[PDB]
Structure 1
Amino acid sequence: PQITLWKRPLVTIKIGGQLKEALLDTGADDTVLEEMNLPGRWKPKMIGGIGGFIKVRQYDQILIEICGHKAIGTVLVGPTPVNIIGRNLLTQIGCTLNF
């Protein structure tokens, strides 16, 4: 799919049996999702953005279907107001920027 940018690049994702909307974000090193329950063992971690760092939980090898393309990777969970699909997963679905 070719996605233009006049609107926020929001896509449908499926994780843990749940359906959600997430932002395909070229400016995020990592993938960070709003609060939700995931497969158990996690490591503490912090992430920075504009205006301040937040604490998040890091889960490894998590399956995530992004607009129909499966990918497994590290997923962080914490107090972000929007679901963010970062480069770690964008590279897995073969996503690129073009102009």
Structure 2
Amino acid sequence: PQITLWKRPLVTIKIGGQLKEALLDTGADDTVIEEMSLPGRWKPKMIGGIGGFIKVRQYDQIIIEICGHKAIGTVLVGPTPVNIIGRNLLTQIGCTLNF
């Protein structure tokens, strides 16, 4: 739908069998979820942000049901303070910025 930005755009995502809320962040390239157990193999890597870099585990092709729609792609797991849905998944559910 259309989402106004007076409030944090927080949605409910279904991932790895668990429900979690996340923030739609158009600024982020990837999707960073809090430390949790996901199945598969992963390669460790470091993403940087405001404040510095954090070490994370990159799992490939994971399915996420972000707000009623499914999407597949990479998910980085680690010590992030908030669950963030980034560009690599926002494009899959057809999200655009309009003004």
TM-score (norm 2): 0.98
1:49-84 CA-partner distances (Å, limit 9, x unpaired): 011100000000000000011000000000001000
**More strand as a share of residues:** 2
Q: Distance in 1 between matches of 2:93 and 2:30?
A: 14
Q: Distance in 2 between matches of 1:50 and 1:16?
A: 28
SS in 1 for 2:40: coil
TM-score (norm 1): 0.98
Uncovered stretches (5+) of structure 2, i.e. residues with no partner: none
Uncovered stretches (5+) of structure 1, i.e. residues with no partner: none
- Displacement, 1:39? 1.2
- Displacement, 1:94? 0.6
Q: Distance in 2 between matches of 1:37 and 1:51?
A: 26
Q: Is 1:40 aligned with 2:34?
A: no
1:7-66 CA-partner distances (Å, limit 9, x unpaired): 000000000110000000001001000011111200011101011100000000000000
SS in 1 for 2:89: helix
Q: Percent identity?
A: 97
Q: How many residues align?
A: 99
Q: Distance in 2 between matches of 1:3 and 1:36?
A: 29
Q: Distance in 1 between matches of 2:57 and 2:3?
A: 30
